[PDB]
Amino acid sequence: QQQPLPVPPLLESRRGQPLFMTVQRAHWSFTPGTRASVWGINGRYLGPTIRVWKGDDVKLIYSNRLTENVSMTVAGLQVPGPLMGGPARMMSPNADWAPVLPIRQNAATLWYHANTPNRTAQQVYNGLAGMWLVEDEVSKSLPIPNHYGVDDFPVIIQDKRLDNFGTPEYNEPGSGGFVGDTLLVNGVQSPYVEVSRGWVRLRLLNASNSRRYQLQMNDGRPLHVISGDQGFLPAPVSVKQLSLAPGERREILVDMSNGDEVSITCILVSTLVLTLRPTGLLPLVTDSLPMRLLPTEIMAGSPIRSRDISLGDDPGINGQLWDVNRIDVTAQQGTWERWTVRADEPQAFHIEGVMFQIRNVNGAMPFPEDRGWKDTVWVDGQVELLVYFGQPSWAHFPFYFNSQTLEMADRGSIGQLLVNPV
């Protein structure tokens, strides 16, 4: 018998109001009749879902109760380098960091996690990560499910290697990323989520070290995408299969009106991700898909500078290993650039303090789907990104563009980007 999907408690800004993020130990059940000591925030595996609002000036208070140095960051966050994390704001055991973040981006599904140098893969794999939501006018305005824990759920997909007793074991692969055999959603294996008979909103997130999944409904039904690493798409995208690379995030809408049970599927022991089961009565005659999400498909402008980012088979970017004292890219705040990212060996690529649009994929066109605002992209050969640098950074508090395959970032596959104001 499968277990219910665990829903991390909601910790929004605008109602308490310092947001107390305590990194600490554990005790989680990755399996029935088992218990392992893991890592997370506020006594949970992973963390609580954070909710902030555009225009907010949030006070985050990070406290390190772990047994080692820790540096936290929010993937996809739009703020100056001095407010990102990671190495520049490292926290030693019992140390705390209380920044004041000014939210100024459109609604989106982000995520936070540890990015400690040489130690990111093991820290994230320990359960040190969570969801981060940015709400605005548009979002809570659309006729879409927005009742967190009720019709709006966070689907944090994870890849684990749990021993027989239920403890996640991480034996350093090295040559490549880490690959597990047990699918985990929100900490539990192939859970089921009891939803009502109507539209269901799922916020998918790949918090895997390197594994990339291709999801689909076990019943063949299409699947409505509305986001969106960095926000809603101009309009819903109905697809049969969905690609989700590590660090990638996507919001899909599911219609559970027919009443019959549906599951999401992707060596692994089980290909079952999550099961949705209607729980009771009807609406009625509740909502067909909106026709258009983004009020305005306000898109890309002209680039004034082009770059060539190369990765490959070994750690490093353009044949160089991460250097805290080296600035690899110097952009101008408020400009547009065209980055050509290439990779012999497939992997995810991420860029901090920026947002971009995939313009080309191997000389071909990107999917529906991948035509919105993003900060993470899957590379297997070469992709062309239209980048916009709306935030500033400092030489000693720069932004990072990295290989999203944790074992490789932790190994030198990191570059430092300096954005000049303004």
From Swiss-Prot:
Domain of life: Bacteria
One Gene Ontology term of the molecular function aspect: copper ion binding
Keyword Transferase annotated: no
UniProt-annotated location(s): Periplasm
UniProt cross-references to InterPro entries, sorted A to Z: Cu-oxidase-like_N, Cu-oxidase_C, Cu-oxidase_fam, Cupredoxin, FtsP, TAT_signal, TAT_signal_bac_arc
GO cellular component: cell division site; outer membrane-bounded periplasmic space
PTM annotation, UniProt: Exported by the Tat system. The position of the signal peptide cleavage has been experimentally proven. Can also be exported by the Sec system.
Phenotype seen when the gene is deleted: Cells lacking this gene are sensitive to oxidative stress and DNA damage at high temperature. They also exhibit filamentation.
Domain Plastocyanin-like intervals: 39-135
UniProt keyword list: Cell cycle, Cell division, Periplasm, Signal
UniProt-listed GO biological process terms: cell division; FtsZ-dependent cytokinesis; response to ionizing radiation; response to oxidative stress; response to stress
Pfam families given in the database record: Cu-oxidase_2, Cu-oxidase_3
UniProt record similarity statement: Belongs to the FtsP family.
Function: Cell division protein that is required for growth during stress conditions. May be involved in protecting or stabilizing the divisomal assembly under conditions of stress.
Miscellaneous comment as given in the Swiss-Prot or TrEMBL entry: Is used as a model substrate in studies of the twin-arginine translocation (Tat) protein transport system.
UniProt cross-references to NCBIfam families, sorted A to Z: PRK10883.1, TAT_signal_seq
Record protein name field: Cell division protein FtsP
Native species: Escherichia coli (strain K12)
Encoding gene (name): ftsP
